[PDB]
Each structure stands twice: as C-alpha cells, then as structure tokens.
Write an enzyme that holds these catalytic residues in place. Structure first.
Site, PDB file in Angstrom:
ATOM      1  N   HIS A 253     -15.148 -15.656  -3.372  1.00 22.34           N
ATOM      2  CA  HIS A 253     -14.000 -15.170  -2.623  1.00 22.34           C
ATOM      3  C   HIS A 253     -13.634 -13.839  -3.232  1.00 22.34           C
ATOM      4  CE1 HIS A 253     -10.281 -16.578  -5.161  1.00 22.34           C
ATOM      5  NE2 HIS A 253     -11.238 -16.102  -5.935  1.00 22.34           N
TER       6      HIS A 253
ATOM      7  N   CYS B 181      -9.612  -8.953  -9.156  1.00 23.14           N
ATOM      8  CA  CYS B 181      -9.434 -10.024  -8.198  1.00 23.14           C
ATOM      9  C   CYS B 181      -9.866  -9.578  -6.805  1.00 23.14           C
ATOM     10  CB  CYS B 181      -7.990 -10.516  -8.189  1.00 23.14           C
ATOM     11  SG  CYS B 181      -7.552 -11.798  -9.479  1.00 23.14           S
TER      12      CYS B 181
ATOM     13  N   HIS C 258     -16.253 -12.088  -6.219  1.00 21.32           N
ATOM     14  CA  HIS C 258     -16.600 -12.948  -7.343  1.00 21.32           C
ATOM     15  C   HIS C 258     -16.560 -14.403  -6.837  1.00 21.32           C
ATOM     16  CE1 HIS C 258     -12.268 -12.572  -7.238  1.00 21.32           C
ATOM     17  NE2 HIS C 258     -12.159 -13.670  -7.972  1.00 21.32           N
TER      18      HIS C 258
ATOM     19  N   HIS D 141     -16.067 -18.933  -8.291  1.00 24.24           N
ATOM     20  CA  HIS D 141     -15.647 -19.898  -9.327  1.00 24.24           C
ATOM     21  C   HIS D 141     -16.242 -21.248  -8.993  1.00 24.24           C
ATOM     22  CE1 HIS D 141     -12.395 -17.100 -10.410  1.00 24.24           C
ATOM     23  NE2 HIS D 141     -12.052 -17.086  -9.131  1.00 24.24           N
TER      24      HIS D 141
ATOM     25  N   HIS E 123     -20.284 -24.005  -1.639  1.00 23.91           N
ATOM     26  CA  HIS E 123     -21.414 -23.129  -1.439  1.00 23.91           C
ATOM     27  C   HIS E 123     -21.198 -22.205  -0.253  1.00 23.91           C
ATOM     28  CE1 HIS E 123     -23.384 -25.185  -4.649  1.00 23.91           C
ATOM     29  NE2 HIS E 123     -24.320 -24.254  -4.597  1.00 23.91           N
TER      30      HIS E 123
ATOM     31  N   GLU F 192      -8.744 -22.678  -9.968  1.00 27.57           N
ATOM     32  CA  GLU F 192      -9.689 -21.558  -9.885  1.00 27.57           C
ATOM     33  C   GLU F 192     -10.600 -21.438 -11.118  1.00 27.57           C
ATOM     34  OE1 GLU F 192      -7.717 -18.482  -7.785  1.00 27.57           O
ATOM     35  OE2 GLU F 192      -9.085 -16.957  -8.588  1.00 27.57           O
TER      36      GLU F 192
HETATM   37 ZN   LIG Z   1     -25.668 -21.011  -7.282  1.00 26.46          ZN
HETATM   38 ZN   LIG Z   2     -10.704 -15.593  -8.262  1.00 28.73          ZN
END
Ligand SMILES: [Zn+2]
Ligand SMILES: [Zn+2]
Ligand SMILES: [Zn+2]
Ligand SMILES: [Zn+2]
Ligand SMILES: [Zn+2]
Ligand SMILES: [Zn+2]
Lengths: 120, 121, 121, 121, 121, 120
Positions: free
Chosen positions: A15, A26, A30, A32, A70, A109
C-alpha cells in the site's frame, strides 16, 4: 456467562498513502505483514461450551482475507487512502453484516504499532 | 492514589478434547496446546511500595490452579468436561476470584492466533 | 468522525533497583530489563487524512523522554526514585500528557510475561 | 543411536556496563536487559529413553550459574568485569562445560535483535 | 547457482505422553503442546525463478505428514511409540526424506524455550 | 575466542515476482515485513571484549537498509526478481566489501519462512 473471543489473521500486502508530503516514507510504495484480530462478544452457549466456533469466523472472513492478501490495498474500492485506521473501518464494514457479534477489529501494520475500531 | 491494571502471564502444556463437536471434527480428537493465560488485576498504587501488589504474589496465588492444569488432561479436571477456551476462562475465574479479590480479567489463548477473555460479567 | 485507538510501542534497555521491597527480595538488588512501552492515543479519525495523528509526530514528541530511559539507570531519574512499573507508567504519563493531548493509555512491560497499564485515573 | 542437537533457553534480568568503551558511548552507562541464553548439547539418542538428556537435567545443572546471573549486576561477578555478550558467552561455557560434557553451543541475546554464539573454538 | 538454505515452519497442536519416564515424572502424564516444526532444504538458486524451490511446495509436500500429526495423539502414530522431540525429529525425517531429497534439517520445538535438531544418518 | 554475532533489522517493503506462472499469488503487487539478520564471525579482541562494535555494523548496514525499507523492491538495481534468495545475494554483494567478517545473511519474508546465505 458473556465473554470476548478473538481470532487473528496475517495478510501480506502493498500500500502507499496519497496525502502525505513529498519526502514522506509512508507515501512511497511499500508493504507489510498486516495482522488483523477479529473480536466477538456474546453469551457462551451452555450445550456447546462456546460463543461461536472459531472455524465459522475463519470461513466468514476468508473472501475478505482473499481480497486483502497478496494484493495492493490502494486498488480495492474505498481504500485509496489505506491508513491503518481506514483499513480497520473497511474490515469492520465488510464483516459486520456477516458477523453481528463483531465487537472489535484490530490491525497491526507493523510489530510495534496497532489500531483498534469498535464501530463507534 | 492512582488506579492501574496489572497482568501476569502463564503457559501450560495440556491435552484436551471436545465432547460435543461433530464426529469428524478435529477438535473432537485427542489433541493438546501450549495454553497461555493472562491474569489481570486493578487497584490503587501504594505510595510506599509503589505498586498494586507484587507480580510474584499473583504467580503465587495462581500456582495451585496452574499445577492442576499444566502437564495434564483437562477433561479429567472436575468442571472442565467440555474444556473449550470459554469454559477454561470461567473455570479459572471461579477458582481465582475468592483468592484474588482485585481480579479483573482472565485471558486464555489456546493458540498463538486465538483467545478468550472473561471479566466475570 | 469515527472514534479509534492507536498505539506505538518502544523498547528501552535500562537498569533499576526497588528501594522499598523487603530484605532478601530479588528486586532490591541492582538488575535490569528490556522494558517495552506502548503509547496509546484515542480520537476522531479525520476523513481526509485517514488518521487521528501522524505516528511520526508521536515518535518525535516521545523521543527526549525515551532517551532519558534508554541505556540508563532508572533510579537516577528524578521522580523515579522507586522505579516500579506502576511509577514508570505514571512518570511517563506526566511527561507526555502536556505534549500529547490525545494520550489515552501508557502500558509498560518489564518482562515478557508481566505488564502494567495506566489511563490517568 | 541418531546424532542430534538439543537446546534449552533461559532468561535472566540483569544490569551491566562496558568499562572500556569511548567516553560518551551508550554501552558505558549503567543499563540492563532481559538476557536470553540458550544452552545447546549434542549426542547420540538413547534407544531406551528416546532422548540424549532430560531437558530438566540441563535445567538442574544450569540453576547455580543462572542464579548468579539473574537479578544481579554482571560487573561484580568474577571473570565478568567486561561483560560484553562475547565474554558472557565464554564465561557461561567456562562455568558449564565441566558439568555438562555434551555441551556444544552457548547462545546469548542481550536484546530481541542481537545475538552471540560460542562453540568452544 | 548460488548455494543456500531455506526453511518453512509449521505448528501442530498435539497430545502425547512419554511411556518410559519414572512413575512421578510430569512427561509420563497425558499432556500436549503447540509443537513447531521447521523443514530445511539446501540447494542451488535457479537463475530464472530466483529460488531453490517455492516455499509452497515444501508445504504441499509436508501436508500429508503434518495432517497425521496435527490435532492428534502422537503415541497412536506408528514409529512414535515414544514421542520425544528426538524420536519425532527422526520420524519426521524418515517420512519426509523420500519425498524431498534436498531435505537438510528437521527442527522440532516442544515448547517456546526448547528444541531439537536432526540432519539424518 | 572465535565467535559469531548477529544483528536483526525489519524492512517494510513491496515486491512482486515476475517469473512465477500466470495464476501465482506472488506475481501480484504485494509486500512483507521482511526481517534480515546480519551475522559476523571473528576473534574477540581481549581489550574491547568484542569482535566488532555493533554500532559500526549498524552504521554500515543502515543506508542499504534505507533502500529496502518503505520502498518497492523491484525498483532497486539488481532486485528485478526480488525473491528471498536474491535478497540474500544482493545484501551480501552490497555489504561484504565493507564488512569482511560478514559470515551469513538471513532473510525472513514471513514469520514462518526464511532463507540463509553464506557466500557459496
Ligand atoms: Zn512475497
Ligand atoms: Zn505502511
Ligand atoms: Zn483445542
Ligand atoms: Zn525489576
Ligand atoms: Zn548492553
Ligand atoms: Zn511433552
């Protein structure tokens, strides 16, 4: 008796936040290992010894989990600003009609951060 | 005078089995877990000791209950013939309340990703 | 605006000693912990920004307080002459609340199985 | 008659400081941690007992050393005047190999994100 | 092809007891654990896929063995008449090796502070 | 006097695998909280009581970490196929010339998996 149950899930997603300044980490693409805890409150059934089977909570969550896991969160309608807060709200909204006893959604997160929503 | 909550956590390694689930359900087979239980209290902090009560006293109070639980088959314990997470919470609360009047919450985790919380309500 | 609760967790490596425990009690010896602290805020989520408060600002506000605690002897800090979890919680609250109005909870863990929680009450 | 490596992990809550680090280094201040130490042993698996050694014989043997370490200032223990993770690993080995001939490794973790390993070499 | 080691971890919630410990010993009581198993492989990284083997393949391979173990009483499993971590390591290895030739290590954790590690004969 | 040290970091990153078959979950834009452990081997100096000051390892590894964290891994040169294996190899290439006691690189894409490289 009345207790609170919970079940935790982890989804692996990307996201980015659209409304932060240019130099803000942010706002970069990136991702998580998100964790989501699903809480439910209710009267514990005398005969089954439980509020609700954990497995029914896993089955109800699955299609929502599969949208999130995913995937890139910014592509889901309503999550163009996928903050932890908005992700809590969205998960709550998806679940609540399918799971009336929903009392709390918690998303982590990262390992050292958390957000919690109760429909308030 | 400040009001605060404390908690202390214990693990116990036990077997259990659910008697009322359907004939092929996995919970109905003899299995086991590393159960975690957190014991929560609330009260006022003493200006001298600087605490509500020593964490070690909470451990000490729970020890007899914990010994029944740990390295044992939960279904053999009077009161836990359906040892679900919910039933384990109410049972520990019944056991602990008279010993620990400031008790505010019992939390049991059957696995790393699940759990039950009971406030005596 | 919808009301929510957010936390950020920090870890500090510190020494301490309890002055008012009985003769022979382990906490009266100089020792230490990997202390964990979670800072919780409550508030209305802003519809545009999608947050209550930028975590990064919280991290910045808490920094000089964190730096007093980390890799330091807690007893040498003014107001922490009796550095129990309880007094840590309250000390941290008192330092942070003037600078973070939405602060709703301070949670301190001296060990991986123990915990203290203060809401200002 | 299979060859395997076993381990048991302990946590001690201790204070320390490094004497030899440059003037304003953080490791030179009085601080502490919840140290994790893993004791690893190697051997043939006994066909009768189905194990190398009882996890609880290792625990029984380690208890004297563990208790020196836990809830104490590490700099006051002879041979630990410079209590880096490295010297700690060596010291534990020196204390333990005499009493556990099948000792193969000592693992010390000052924090959740660091570690030191010694194999007697 | 760079040479590397992969691993995939699994948790099975199982009951067991040790039939050969002295009459009082806790391990001879019927109990259980959240057993963690880690399956390791070694080999060369493919220049196109960029991997040795997809993690999901290791999982798919282990699945029939995992399903024997999980939510069951280990003692009832043939080969596991003495289900110690050691025997369970040797047993997992024996079942897995024909199916996954690159297998290099099986790692079993009966608890959160203990472990066993096997690499075949 | 011969020991092995490590230090662990967590990078929150997006990635996708370009060379997985058409329906495979990893070919979608996603992310993980990646954990990397950096291990060194060496002789403990009798005076400092260490092999290497951790502060120096952290300072050396830091800007490499800053490239990974809060970023899209596929945009890093050399990470066009950002598997855990390629992650390990990339980190070892970047770091080895500047940290010769580097003995091992370990990345965990999720809490249940891991990859270990020792320059072979
Ligand atoms: Zn992966
Ligand atoms: Zn984040
Ligand atoms: Zn169960
Ligand atoms: Zn203490
Ligand atoms: Zn230190
Ligand atoms: Zn056992």
């Amino acid at each position: 008796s009345h207790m609170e149950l919970f079940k935790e899930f982890t989804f692996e997603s990307a996201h980015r936040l659209p409304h932060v300044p240019e130099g803000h980490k942010c706002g970069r693409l990136h991702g998580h290992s998100f964790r989501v805890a699903i809480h439910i409150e209710g009267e514990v059934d005398p005969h089954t010894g439980w509020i609700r089977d954990f497995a029914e909570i896993k089955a109800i969550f699955k299609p929502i989990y599969e949208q999130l896991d995913h995937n890139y969160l910014n592509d889901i309608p309503g999550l163009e600003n996928p903050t932890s807060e908005n992700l809590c709200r969205w998960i709550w909204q998806q679940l609540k009609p399918l799971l009336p006893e929903l009392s709390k959604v918690r998303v982590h997160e990262t390992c050292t951060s958390g957000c919690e929503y109760r429909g308030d």
